[PDB]
C-alpha cells in the first residue's frame, strides 16, 4: 500500500530541473528583446 | 523514477529481515534447553503423549 | 513481563537511520532551492 | 527430493554481485551524462 501511494503522489527530479532550466532561459530572452523593442521609436526624433 | 520522498526497496529489506531473525531465535533456544518441545507451540499432540 | 515491556517500549535501529537520512538529503535540498529562488529578481534590475 | 528442489529454487551470488555492479556504474555514467546534456543549450543565449 504505501509503494501504490508513492506511485500516485511522489514528484520526479530530472523532469522538473529541466522545466525549470527550459523556463530561466525565456525569461531572459523576453527581458532582451522588450528592451530592443521598446528602444524603438527614439529614430523618428531625428526627423525633425 | 529518482523520487527521494519514499524509499521503497529499504521496506522490503526490513521486512524481510525478520524471517531469518525468527529461525535464529528458535535454533539458539532449543540448543540450550536440551530438547525439541519448548511449549505447545510446536506441537499439541506430542506434549499430551 | 520484561519481554513484554520491551515489546512496549524500545526503539528499532533501521527505521530510525532510514528516516534521519531521507531528513537530511531534503535538508540540503531546501538550502540550495533557496539559493536558487533568492536570485530570481536580479533581472528587473537589468531592465534600467 | 531437497537436493532436487534447491537446483530449481536456490539463487547464485557471484552472478548477482556482478550484475548489481554492473548496474550502479552505469547509472553513475547516465547521471553525469544528463547533466552535461541538459547545460548544453545556454550558449544560444549568447548569440542575443
Given at each position: ?28 530572452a ?18 525633425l | ?31 540450550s ?17
Amino acid at each position: 500500500l504505501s509503494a501504490s501511494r508513492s506511485r500516485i503522489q511522489d514528484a520526479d527530479y530530472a523532469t522538473e530541473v529541466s522545466n525549470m532550466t527550459r523556463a530561466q532561459i525565456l525569461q531572459q530572452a523576453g527581458t532582451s528583446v522588450l528592451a530592443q523593442a521598446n528602444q524603438t521609436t527614439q529614430n523618428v526624433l531625428s526627423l525633425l | 523514477a529518482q523520487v527521494i520522498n519514499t524509499n521503497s526497496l529499504s521496506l522490503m529489506t526490513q521486512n524481510n529481515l525478520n524471517t531469518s531473525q525468527s529461525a535464529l531465535n528458535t535454533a539458539i533456544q532449543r540448543l540450550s534447553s536440551g530438547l525439541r518441545i519448548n511449549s505447545a507451540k510446536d506441537d499439541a499432540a506430542g506434549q499430551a503423549i
